[PDB]
Amino acid sequence: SCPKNWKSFSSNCYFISTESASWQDSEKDCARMEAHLLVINTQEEQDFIFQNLQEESAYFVGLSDPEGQRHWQWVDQTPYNESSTFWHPREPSDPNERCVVLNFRKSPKRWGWNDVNCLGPQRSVCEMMK
């Protein structure tokens, strides 16, 4: 049973942020609640998260590229398989955008990933293992 104000899925719990913070301060805050930033593992997990996000907002996810070499890593250290990614067309787009967000686009309407800046505050998704 997930806590108050935490969406439930499979055997895990998810918190969709309303406040904004940098990628590191987002992972810092997920850790304070004994969780990590979201780590998309299956197609079903991703679609469940999209159903609870605001199309007008971007959401930080535990996927980053620290050195800027497009070496993507998950916070929970699990392997990255590009074929199971939800990158928008044109994305990733810039070596200096080192952190992945879930964002919605209007033409055409599509949920997907986008590498954006890490310091610029955004919303985030914490994933807690129950």
Ligand SMILES: CC(=O)N[C@H]1[C@H](O[C@H]2[C@@H](O)[C@H](O)[C@@H](CO)O[C@@H]2O)O[C@H](CO)[C@@H](O)[C@@H]1O
């Ligand atoms: C349209 C879009 O995704 N805007 C987001 C914006 O994006 C940058 C850049 O990261 C994208 O690769 C390109 C794609 O055209 O658009 C912009 O130049 O980043 C913002 C945060 O940095 C998001 O809030 C916007 O949603």
Ligand SMILES: [Ca+2]
């Ligand atoms: Ca997960």
Ligand SMILES: [Ca+2]
């Ligand atoms: Ca981008």
